[PDB]
Amino acid sequence: VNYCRLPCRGDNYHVGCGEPAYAQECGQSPRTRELLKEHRNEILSKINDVRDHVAKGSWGLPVAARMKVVVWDAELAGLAKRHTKGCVGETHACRNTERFWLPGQLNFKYSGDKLPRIKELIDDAVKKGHLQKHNITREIIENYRENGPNGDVKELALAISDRVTAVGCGLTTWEDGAKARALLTCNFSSQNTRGRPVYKIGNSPGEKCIEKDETYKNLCSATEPIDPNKSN
Numbered sequence: 001v002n003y004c005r006l007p008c009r010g011d012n013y014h015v016g017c018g019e020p021a022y023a024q025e026c027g028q029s030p031r032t033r034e035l036l037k038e039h040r041n042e043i044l045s046k047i048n049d050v051r052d053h054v055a056k057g058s059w060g061l062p063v064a065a066r067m068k069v070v071v072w073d074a075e076l077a078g079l080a081k082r083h084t085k086g087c088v089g090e091t092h093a094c095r096n097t098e099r100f101w102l103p104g105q106l107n108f109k110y111s112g113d114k115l116p117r118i119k120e121l122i123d124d125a126v127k128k129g130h131l132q133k134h135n136i137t138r139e140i141i142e143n144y145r146e147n148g149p150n151g152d153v154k155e156l157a158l159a160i161s162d163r164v165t166a167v168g169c170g171l172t173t174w175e176d177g178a179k180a181r182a183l184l185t186c187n188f189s190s191q192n193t194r195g196r197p198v199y200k201i202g203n204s205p206g207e208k209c210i211e212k213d214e215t216y217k218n219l220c221s222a223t224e225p226i227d228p229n230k231s232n
């Protein structure tokens, strides 16, 4: 759609409006990086692996009643890509779409002497989020607080939201401060709501799916009619 004509509460500019430009903050060697089919599958795979483990009742975390298999969203991905071109993690830009009224977003910054391959950047972000299982409590799951803590849970808690139905990421790499740098941004179809459950508890995993998936046995299939625009 036309993002310059899709308003949002707060009336902030939309990340998607106008022509794509690289931010000055990107220095003078920025390059946007295409997440190819294998990159999108790896991302989907890791996010669905962990959703399946958690919904199972892993880490004493409660069992999940209706946690869905996630799909890639090209629209979210475009907005993510476009966001990385600003070379900055946090902005007040709007990023809503017609389908996903309040998309969550995660940003993974990298800084080092050398630039790792795209796959290595993704595994870094996967590793970072995975490492928060040492931080996420069932308390957090019953009643989302982001801080907390100690310590950080936002990344992992967003990957296991049962309101989330779709993800889309983008990547820009550049050079500044004598370091190779990268911003990896993932937009999600939904977001965790402060004070509300990350996902709804059950006795059996997926006991509330119309249809459980055949690969991620503890999750609802791709066609589960979850509303990503309602919170828990």
Ligand SMILES: CCCCC/C=C\C\C=C/C=C/C=C/C[C@@H](O)CCCC(=O)O
Binding pocket: 043, 046, 047, 049, 050, 053, 058, 122, 125, 126, 127, 128, 129, 130, 133, 155, 156, 159, 169, 186
């Ligand atoms: C672009 C990356 C998006 C990051 C989203 C945030 C967190 C997802 C993080 C980790 C997923 C890890 C999967 C690990 C292996 C799999 O067997 C999961 C179970 C391992 C375990 O139970 O500790």
Ligand SMILES: [Pr+3]
Binding pocket: none
């Ligand atoms: Pr292509």
